[PDB]
Scaffold this active site. Structure first.
Site, PDB file in Angstrom:
ATOM      1  N   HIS A 148     -28.364  20.758  27.480  1.00 58.64           N
ATOM      2  CA  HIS A 148     -27.212  21.432  27.077  1.00 58.64           C
ATOM      3  C   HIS A 148     -26.360  20.831  26.176  1.00 58.64           C
ATOM      4  O   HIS A 148     -26.422  19.745  26.011  1.00 58.64           O
ATOM      5  CB  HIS A 148     -26.399  21.827  28.385  1.00 58.64           C
ATOM      6  CG  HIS A 148     -25.610  20.528  28.991  1.00 58.64           C
ATOM      7  ND1 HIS A 148     -26.068  20.117  30.255  1.00 58.64           N
ATOM      8  CD2 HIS A 148     -24.625  19.935  28.542  1.00 58.64           C
ATOM      9  CE1 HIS A 148     -25.561  19.117  30.579  1.00 58.64           C
ATOM     10  NE2 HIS A 148     -24.640  18.971  29.513  1.00 58.64           N
ATOM     11  N   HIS A 153     -23.528   8.141  24.546  1.00 51.23           N
ATOM     12  CA  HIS A 153     -22.101   8.634  24.655  1.00 51.23           C
ATOM     13  C   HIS A 153     -21.516   7.368  24.243  1.00 51.23           C
ATOM     14  O   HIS A 153     -20.445   7.247  23.709  1.00 51.23           O
ATOM     15  CB  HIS A 153     -22.014   8.535  26.240  1.00 51.23           C
ATOM     16  CG  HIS A 153     -22.137   9.976  26.770  1.00 51.23           C
ATOM     17  ND1 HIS A 153     -21.446  10.957  26.444  1.00 51.23           N
ATOM     18  CD2 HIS A 153     -23.254  10.114  27.749  1.00 51.23           C
ATOM     19  CE1 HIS A 153     -22.104  12.121  27.127  1.00 51.23           C
ATOM     20  NE2 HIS A 153     -23.156  11.557  28.062  1.00 51.23           N
ATOM     21  N   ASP A 211     -21.084  10.239  33.453  1.00 53.18           N
ATOM     22  CA  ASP A 211     -21.365  11.531  33.202  1.00 53.18           C
ATOM     23  C   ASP A 211     -22.222  12.211  34.340  1.00 53.18           C
ATOM     24  O   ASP A 211     -22.525  11.345  35.445  1.00 53.18           O
ATOM     25  CB  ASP A 211     -22.289  11.528  31.830  1.00 53.18           C
ATOM     26  CG  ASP A 211     -23.852  11.606  31.921  1.00 53.18           C
ATOM     27  OD1 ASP A 211     -24.281  11.218  32.953  1.00 53.18           O
ATOM     28  OD2 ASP A 211     -24.364  11.788  30.939  1.00 53.18           O
ATOM     29  N   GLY A 271     -18.832  12.880  30.572  1.00 47.81           N
ATOM     30  CA  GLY A 271     -18.543  14.325  30.837  1.00 47.81           C
ATOM     31  C   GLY A 271     -17.132  14.088  31.715  1.00 47.81           C
ATOM     32  O   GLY A 271     -16.517  15.233  31.865  1.00 47.81           O
ATOM     33  N   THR A 287      -5.372  27.679  20.536  1.00 46.41           N
ATOM     34  CA  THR A 287      -6.512  27.963  21.604  1.00 46.41           C
ATOM     35  C   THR A 287      -7.889  28.325  20.787  1.00 46.41           C
ATOM     36  O   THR A 287      -7.479  28.859  19.931  1.00 46.41           O
ATOM     37  CB  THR A 287      -6.084  29.222  22.574  1.00 46.41           C
ATOM     38  OG1 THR A 287      -7.324  29.938  23.017  1.00 46.41           O
ATOM     39  CG2 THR A 287      -5.223  30.420  21.747  1.00 46.41           C
TER      40      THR A 287
HETATM   41  N1  LIG Z   1     -24.878  14.280  30.480  1.00 50.26           N
HETATM   42  C1  LIG Z   1     -24.680  15.126  31.051  1.00 50.26           C
HETATM   43  O1  LIG Z   1     -25.302  15.611  32.239  1.00 50.26           O
HETATM   44  O2  LIG Z   1     -23.804  15.925  30.679  1.00 50.26           O
HETATM   45  P1  LIG Z   1     -22.378  15.586  30.294  1.00 50.26           P
HETATM   46  O3  LIG Z   1     -22.102  14.245  30.053  1.00 50.26           O
HETATM   47  O4  LIG Z   1     -21.464  16.687  29.455  1.00 50.26           O
HETATM   48  O5  LIG Z   1     -21.912  16.069  31.888  1.00 50.26           O
HETATM   49  C2  LIG Z   1     -20.413  16.199  32.142  1.00 50.26           C
HETATM   50  C3  LIG Z   1     -19.922  16.313  33.788  1.00 50.26           C
HETATM   51  O6  LIG Z   1     -18.677  16.335  33.780  1.00 50.26           O
HETATM   52  C4  LIG Z   1     -18.254  17.342  34.701  1.00 50.26           C
HETATM   53  N2  LIG Z   1     -16.919  17.610  34.392  1.00 50.26           N
HETATM   54  C5  LIG Z   1     -16.601  18.429  33.020  1.00 50.26           C
HETATM   55  N3  LIG Z   1     -15.337  18.651  32.811  1.00 50.26           N
HETATM   56  C6  LIG Z   1     -14.809  18.090  34.114  1.00 50.26           C
HETATM   57  C7  LIG Z   1     -13.513  17.711  34.285  1.00 50.26           C
HETATM   58  N4  LIG Z   1     -12.194  18.230  33.666  1.00 50.26           N
HETATM   59  N5  LIG Z   1     -13.338  16.618  35.383  1.00 50.26           N
HETATM   60  C8  LIG Z   1     -14.191  16.335  36.111  1.00 50.26           C
HETATM   61  N6  LIG Z   1     -15.674  16.578  35.787  1.00 50.26           N
HETATM   62  C9  LIG Z   1     -15.684  17.258  34.632  1.00 50.26           C
HETATM   63  C10 LIG Z   1     -19.237  18.224  34.550  1.00 50.26           C
HETATM   64  O7  LIG Z   1     -19.203  19.308  35.455  1.00 50.26           O
HETATM   65  C11 LIG Z   1     -20.626  17.502  34.564  1.00 50.26           C
HETATM   66  O8  LIG Z   1     -21.031  17.114  35.806  1.00 50.26           O
HETATM   67 MG   LIG Z   2     -23.909  12.910  29.344  1.00 51.11          MG
END
Ligand SMILES: NC(=O)OP(=O)(O)OC[C@H]1O[C@@H](n2cnc3c(N)ncnc32)[C@H](O)[C@@H]1O
Ligand SMILES: [Mg+2]
Length: 597
Positions: A35, A161, A180, A335, A559
């Site tokens: 993604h 990252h 993440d 994330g 926005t």
């Molecule tokens: N590497 C990989 O797998 O993708 P990635 O690093 O983008 O993962 C982002 C993660 O942060 C979570 N996440 C997203 N927004 C978030 C928030 N505001 N607070 C907490 N967790 C969050 C989201 O649901 C996901 O589990």
């Molecule tokens: Mg990630």
């Protein structure tokens, strides 16, 4: 030294849809790796170009091979695939990992029947998408360049990252936390950077079954939202509620356990129903049933709980890292650094003087990072840079040609370049929602004033009006303000921060501006602000001076410029098609002021 970093697998779409039932129409459609596919191009250490494939193919968080983005990145630098010295992939599924991953699976307290199913799936993902062979085949089918094994370097996801944060933080020697949803094997790590050299403190490394980020994701699914696309809705809902006592937080006692060395583990981490196992356990903690879960006060109580877990666990991790090293300049990437509320709290309530979360903390950032990681390793001195405006630009001729394709639908006047800012400010003096299309497309999930909808936050009804002029707005989303760097401390409670150019930190609104910037604040009295200077975004800086001198209002609502579930507009084609699909008043695209007929 030309280095291109990327992220995506063409077959990842198909494989999760079959194996795990995570299909394009499912709520679990964004919950598999790949993604936020993208490309980022470094030429001789200057980050020349970058854009996410979601902006080109118009399909949000697209797991696709980033073919259009790699095309564009090369075109921008005026080269082809064959001029690139190393391709950087922001995942590192090597044989050594696959050796450990099976060995791991074999060694686990599970009926061997579940073991065959798991190992076999990992095989389909291995052969289909993840493996160095699938990668080289995937690249070669899509670009047409046949990628020499020599030219491909896979970077450890968490290291990618890290490389994104370092590129933009401004820091030298710094501590760091990556947290993440899931990497090759880890769900979070910490370490430090000292005089060029990254070092992971392996003692804090949390496995992927003990995933803090994926717990929040499960919670987002629980409350009838899209996990991995709508987590801010939970953060958002924690705004309308009071935090429990940490001893009264069901999720912090019966699910998550804090261990010494800033570690943590999860109940039902080894349940072979996968992560859906937490669904009934959540009902057993919150009165959950089929007439209460998608309800409001319910959504709020849970949200507060989940948000506190986030604040609680990350706080522990960082406390540990405090003793683990002397350094007090922190890089937070991955994330969970998308929780901008939590980011401010870490800065203020913990001992780190400086905490830098980039606009690429999420997986979109791992395409930039992958490339940066290889470069630094190749002793390629990297030109410091703070700019997220890395995507496609459009000339005066390309906009005028597009608007003529819509002579039937819209009228437009082409203003003198340096009068636009003042004419848009006059419009913005009214109850007017504006499309703002300028400069190179901004990178990552938040719009930072190049593909933005703007509006005057001073009118009390403006919240309701924006949501009504741009029908197709995604609910449970608060509006964020832009402000000039100089007015930040005057208008917001900044604490240790002097600037937030990426909308990565949230800040309380001082009482003397709460009526003035209402629309750009949450009920928590919080604004996910973007500071703006003549240096970072001269046209945006200029707009604010014109707007503020006329109204004495220091902030505009900023926005994302898009309909629901559509990604941010990239092309002028995108902008006009959106303007027409909304009840937005006007669209200011470059030096043009478009109106509807
Ligand atoms: N590497 C990989 O797998 O993708 P990635 O690093 O983008 O993962 C982002 C993660 O942060 C979570 N996440 C997203 N927004 C978030 C928030 N505001 N607070 C907490 N967790 C969050 C989201 O649901 C996901 O589990
Ligand atoms: Mg990630």
């Amino acid at each position: 030294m030309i280095i291109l970093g990327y992220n995506g697998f063409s077959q990842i779409a198909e494989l999760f849809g079959r194996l795990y039932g995570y299909t394009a129409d499912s709520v679990d459609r964004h919950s598999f790796l790949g993604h936020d596919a993208a490309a980022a191009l470094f030429v001789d250490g200057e980050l020349v170009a970058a854009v996410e494939e979601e902006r080109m193919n118009r399909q949000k968080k697209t797991t696709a091979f980033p073919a259009n983005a790699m095309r564009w990145c090369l075109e921008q630098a005026g080269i082809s695939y064959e001029d690139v010295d190393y391709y950087a992939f922001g995942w590192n599924f090597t044989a050594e990992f696959a050796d450990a991953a099976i060995t791991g699976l074999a060694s686990a307290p599970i009926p061997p029947e579940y073991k065959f199913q798991a190992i076999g799936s990992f095989g389909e993902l291995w052969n289909g998408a993840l493996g160095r062979t699938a990668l080289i085949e995937d690249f070669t089918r899509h670009t047409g360049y046949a990628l020499p094994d020599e030219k491909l370097i896979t970077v450890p996801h968490h290291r990618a990252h890290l490389a994104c944060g370092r590129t933009f933080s401004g820091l030298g020697d710094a501590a760091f936390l990556i947290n993440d949803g899931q990497a090759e094997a880890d769900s979070a790590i910490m370490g430090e950077v000292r005089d060029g050299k990254v070092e992971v403190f392996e003692r804090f490394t949390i496995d992927a079954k003990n995933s803090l980020a994926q717990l929040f994701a499960n919670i987002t699914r629980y409350l009838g939202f899209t996990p991995n696309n709508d987590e801010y809705k939970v953060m958002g809902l924690a705004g309308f509620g009071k935090a429990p006592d940490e001893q009264d937080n069901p999720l912090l006692t019966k699910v998550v356990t804090l261990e010494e060395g800033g570690r943590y583990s999860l109940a039902l981490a080894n349940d072979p129903r996968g992560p859906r196992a937490y669904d009934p356990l959540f009902d057993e903690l919150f009165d959950g049933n089929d007439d209460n879960r998608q309800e409001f006060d319910f959504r709020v109580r849970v949200a507060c709980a989940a948000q506190q877990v986030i604040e609680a666990v990350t706080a522990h991790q960082l406390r540990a890292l405090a003793e683990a090293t002397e350094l007090r300049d922190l890089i937070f990437e991955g994330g969970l650094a998308l929780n901008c509320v939590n980011n401010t709290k870490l800065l203020e309530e913990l001992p780190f003087t400086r905490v830098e979360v980039s606009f690429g903390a999420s997986d979109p950032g791992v395409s930039i990072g992958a490339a940066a990681h290889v470069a630094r390793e190749k002793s390629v001195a990297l030109t410091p840079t703070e700019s997220p405006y890395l995507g496609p630009e459009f000339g005066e001729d390309e906009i005028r040609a597009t608007l003529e394709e819509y002579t039937s639908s819209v009228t437009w006047e082409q203003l003198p370049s340096d009068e636009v800012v003042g004419k848009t400010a006059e419009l913005l003096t009214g109850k007017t929602v504006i499309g703002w299309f300028q400069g190179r497309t901004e990178y990552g999930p938040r719009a930072l004033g190049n593909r933005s909808i703007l509006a005057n936050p001073s009118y009390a009804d403006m919240k309701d009006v924006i949501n009504n002029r741009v029908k197709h707005r995604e609910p449970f989303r608060p509006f964020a303000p832009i402000v000039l760097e100089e007015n930040a401390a005057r208008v917001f409670e900044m604490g240790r921060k002097e600037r937030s150019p990426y909308m990565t930190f949230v800040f309380p609104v001082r009482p003397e501006y709460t009526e003035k910037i209402a629309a750009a604040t949450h009920v928590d009295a919080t604004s996910r602000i973007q500071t703006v200077t003549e240096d970072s975004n001269p046209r945006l800086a200029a707009l604010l001076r014109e707007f503020t001198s006329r109204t004495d209002v220091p902030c505009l609502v900023n926005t994302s410029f898009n309909v629901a579930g559509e990604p941010i507009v990239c092309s002028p084609k995108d902008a006009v098609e959106c303007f027409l699909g909304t009840d937005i008043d006007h669209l200011v695209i470059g030096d043009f002021l478009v109106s509807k007929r």
